[PDB]
């Protein structure tokens, strides 16, 4: 795999979003991976609906948190609509999928990256954007304004994001806190520290969609 990967550069990443005041990170994270895999497979970059996951994944808790892998299962079993068809409202409402016509896309599966293994995650990232979790509660993470983030932080994971590349000493992550946070909405998290949890517990729970 290459020394540098950046899915943004290959046209597999849509603009940065803002989840606002709704704990829908899980849905944002999942959608990033969905958008990436469809571009990679089909050649087209689309935006897909975080709102539909929020409303429809009843295994998750709406604006109160949820599971990226639950959301990814739903898209595998049922499918997903385009973002413009089912736009983000930042509040959980009833599931409106049927009301909105046929699904725009469907994946075939969800896989787990082997946890606590940097090499396993880089390999995955080299193939497509991956759903990853980290500890974002610390003030240091929250106030991050650019550079390679090294912490401080523990491994009490609480935020789902998406990895969209890496370099010699960092993993490139797309956050869902708007373009005004970090490096235009992205963060570079130090890698290769030999900490098996990853910085801020980044190697805890990583998922990606399978599409044939």
Curated annotation (Swiss-Prot):
Binding site for leupeptin: 25
Keyword entries, A-Z: Allergen, Disulfide bond, Hydrolase, Protease, Signal, Thiol protease, Zymogen
Disulfide bonds: 22-63, 56-95, 153-200
Activity regulation description: Repressed by the active-site-directed cysteine protease inhibitor E64 (L-trans-epoxysuccinyl-leucylamide-(4-guanido)-butane) produced by Aspergillus japonicus. Inhibited by the inhibitor of cysteine proteases from Trypanosoma brucei (TbICP, rhodesain) and Colocasia esculenta cv. Kaohsiung no. 1 (CeCPI, tarocystatin). Repressed by leupeptin, a peptidic cysteine, serine and threonine protease inhibitor.
Catalytic activity: Hydrolysis of proteins with broad specificity for peptide bonds, but preference for an amino acid bearing a large hydrophobic side chain at the P2 position. Does not accept Val in P1'
Domain of life: Eukaryota
Amino acids binding E64: 25
Temperature section of the record: Optimum temperature is 50 degrees Celsius. Unstable upon 65 degrees Celsius.
Catalytic residue positions: 25, 159, 175
Entry's pH dependence statement: Optimum pH is 4.
GO biological process: proteolysis
Biological role stated in the UniProt entry: Cysteine proteinase with a high level of diversity in substrate specificity, an amino acid bearing a large hydrophobic side chain at the P2 position is preferred.
Protein name: Papain
Source organism (scientific name): Carica papaya
Portion of the full-length sequence here: 134 to 345 of 345
């Amino acid at each position: 795999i290459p020394e540098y990967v950046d899915w943004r550069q290959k046209g597999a990443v849509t603009p940065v979003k803002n989840q606002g005041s709704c704990g829908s990170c899980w849905a944002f994270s999942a959608v990033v991976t969905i958008e990436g895999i469809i571009k990679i497979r089909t050649g087209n970059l689309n935006q897909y609906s975080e709102q539909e996951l929020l409303d429809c994944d009843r295994r998750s808790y709406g604006c109160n948190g949820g599971y990226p892998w639950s959301a990814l299962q739903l898209v595998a079993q049922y499918g997903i609509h385009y973002r413009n068809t089912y736009p983000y409202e930042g509040v959980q409402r009833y599931c409106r999928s049927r009301e909105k016509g046929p699904y725009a896309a469907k994946t075939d599966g969800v896989r787990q990256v082997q946890p606590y293994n940097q090499g396993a995650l880089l390999y995955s990232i080299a193939n497509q954007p991956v759903s990853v979790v980290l500890q974002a509660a610390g003030k240091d993470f929250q106030l991050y304004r650019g550079g390679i983030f090294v912490g401080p932080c523990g491994n009490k994971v609480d935020h789902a994001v998406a990895a969209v590349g890496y370099g010699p000493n960092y993993i490139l992550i797309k956050n869902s806190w708007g373009t005004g946070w970090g490096e235009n909405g992205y963060i570079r998290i130090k890698r290769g520290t030999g900490n098996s949890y990853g910085v801020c517990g980044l190697y805890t729970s990583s998922f990606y969609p399978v599409k044939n």
